[PDB]
Design a protein around this motif. Structure first.
Motif, PDB file in Angstrom:
ATOM      1  N   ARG A 288      -8.013  -9.206  -4.068  1.00  0.00           N
ATOM      2  CA  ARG A 288      -6.936  -9.295  -3.088  1.00  0.00           C
ATOM      3  C   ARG A 288      -7.478  -9.270  -1.664  1.00  0.00           C
ATOM      4  NH1 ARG A 288      -2.474  -5.335  -6.078  1.00  0.00           N
ATOM      5  NH2 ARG A 288      -1.906  -6.871  -7.695  1.00  0.00           N
TER       6      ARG A 288
ATOM      7  N   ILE B  44      -1.741  -6.939   5.393  1.00  0.00           N
ATOM      8  CA  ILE B  44      -1.521  -7.308   3.990  1.00  0.00           C
ATOM      9  C   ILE B  44      -2.605  -6.718   3.101  1.00  0.00           C
ATOM     10  CG2 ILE B  44      -1.459  -9.274   2.359  1.00  0.00           C
ATOM     11  CD1 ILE B  44      -0.285 -10.925   4.709  1.00  0.00           C
ATOM     12  N   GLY B  45      -2.179  -6.183   1.958  1.00  0.00           N
ATOM     13  CA  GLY B  45      -3.087  -5.765   0.911  1.00  0.00           C
ATOM     14  C   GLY B  45      -2.411  -4.732   0.042  1.00  0.00           C
ATOM     15  N   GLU B  46      -2.153  -5.093  -1.208  1.00  0.00           N
ATOM     16  CA  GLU B  46      -1.407  -4.258  -2.142  1.00  0.00           C
ATOM     17  C   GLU B  46      -2.378  -3.496  -3.038  1.00  0.00           C
ATOM     18  OE1 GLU B  46       2.182  -4.705  -5.489  1.00  0.00           O
ATOM     19  OE2 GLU B  46       0.815  -6.384  -5.144  1.00  0.00           O
TER      20      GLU B  46
HETATM   21 CL   LIG Z   1      -2.375  -8.248  -1.583  1.00  0.00          CL
END
Ligand SMILES: [Cl-]
Ligand SMILES: Nc1ncnc2c1ncn2[C@@H]1O[C@H](CN(CC[C@H](N)C(=O)O)Cc2ccc(F)cc2)[C@@H](O)[C@H]1O
Ligand SMILES: [Cl-]
Ligand SMILES: [Cl-]
Ligand code: NA
Length: 262
Positions: free
Chosen positions: A156, A143-145
């Motif tokens: 984040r 996960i990690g945008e």
């Molecule tokens: Cl994220």
């Protein structure tokens, strides 16, 4: 003092669309996905194809010993399932449970029959930030945008790492956790503290695009946080100068077919 990574991010945001287009894959390693994309579009579930580029990224780590998956695997943010299906092919793995949010703008799990598919359970509709941690042997999280703002990327990443801590307290023996933003002074300090507490180290996967500074915190690495992050920052900075360099290719992972006995 601005870190090398913060200098890279400022330059990235100054690039025109054309500069960014030519920079993002300059000199990286890639798998050709044309065969898999065609097969998956045609509903072929038995051809061995990976459901995403993620399988090749996890393969790169596992084949080099950056982690040794085993036992019960939990895959947080599984998306289509590329890490989960790769993990299911690993001899010591016996169960794979993937969780992903799904819904608009987010990938749903893809059901295919690559080798070991019958030990994989992928669940959509799950926000892992609202999920109680449960014991596992191998903990994966991807996960990690990305954001144009390094402050957003740090926020984040801190949110992911705070959540992952609850799972690491169950003491999995193997782990692979995406670190979206490793490159701020605050993040490097945080990551050093986490390495002292839970072990592992950071590694840059060469299949990552130059447009992200993502690194993976993996249980089998042992390295200086500042050196590993700074080496990656300088690599990405150096690729901003000079001519565009050719992409290097592996063949896409083929995960076979068939079930496993458990
Ligand atoms: Cl994220
Ligand atoms: N809070 C969340 N709970 C559950 N799933 C989430 C949450 N936030 C994001 N996601 C999903 O995580 C996936 C991240 N994917 C995983 C790829 C996988 N390892 C594979 O091999 O197929 C990587 C990713 C894609 C896009 C992006 F902008 C950032 C990361 C996504 O499916 C999220 O929906
Ligand atoms: Cl994400
Ligand atoms: Cl290492
Ligand atoms: Na969706």
């Amino acid at each position: 003092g601005e870190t090398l990574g913060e200098k890279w991010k400022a330059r990235l945001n100054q690039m025109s669309a054309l500069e960014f287009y030519s920079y993002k894959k300059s000199g990286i390693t890639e798998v050709c996905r044309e065969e898999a994309r065609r097969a998956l579009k045609d509903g072929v579930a038995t051809g061995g194809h990976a459901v995403s580029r993620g399988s090749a990224k996890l393969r790169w780590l596992v084949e080099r010993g950056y982690l040794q998956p085993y036992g019960k695997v939990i895959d947080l943010g599984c998306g289509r399932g590329g890490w989960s299906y790769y993990a299911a092919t690993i001899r010591k793995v016996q169960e794979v449970k993937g969780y992903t949010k799904g819904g608009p703008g987010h990938e749903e799990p893809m059901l295919v029959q690559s080798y070991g598919w019958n030990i994989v359970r992928l669940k959509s509709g799950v926000d892992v930030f609202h999920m109680a941690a449960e014991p596992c042997d191998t903990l994966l999280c991807d996960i990690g945008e990305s954001s144009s703002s390094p402050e957003v990327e740090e926020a984040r990443t801190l949110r992911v790492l705070s959540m992952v801590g609850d799972w690491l307290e169950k003491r999995p023996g193997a782990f692979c956790i995406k670190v979206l933003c490793p490159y701020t002074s605050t993040m490097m300090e945080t990551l050093e503290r986490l390495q002292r507490r839970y072990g592992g180290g950071l590694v840059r996967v060469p299949l990552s695009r130059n447009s992200t500074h993502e690194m993976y915190w993996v249980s089998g690495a042992k390295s200086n946080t500042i050196k590993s992050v700074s080496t990656t920052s300088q690599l990405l900075l150096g690729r901003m100068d000079g001519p565009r360099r050719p992409v290097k290719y592996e063949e896409d992972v083929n995960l076979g077919s068939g079930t496993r006995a458990v």
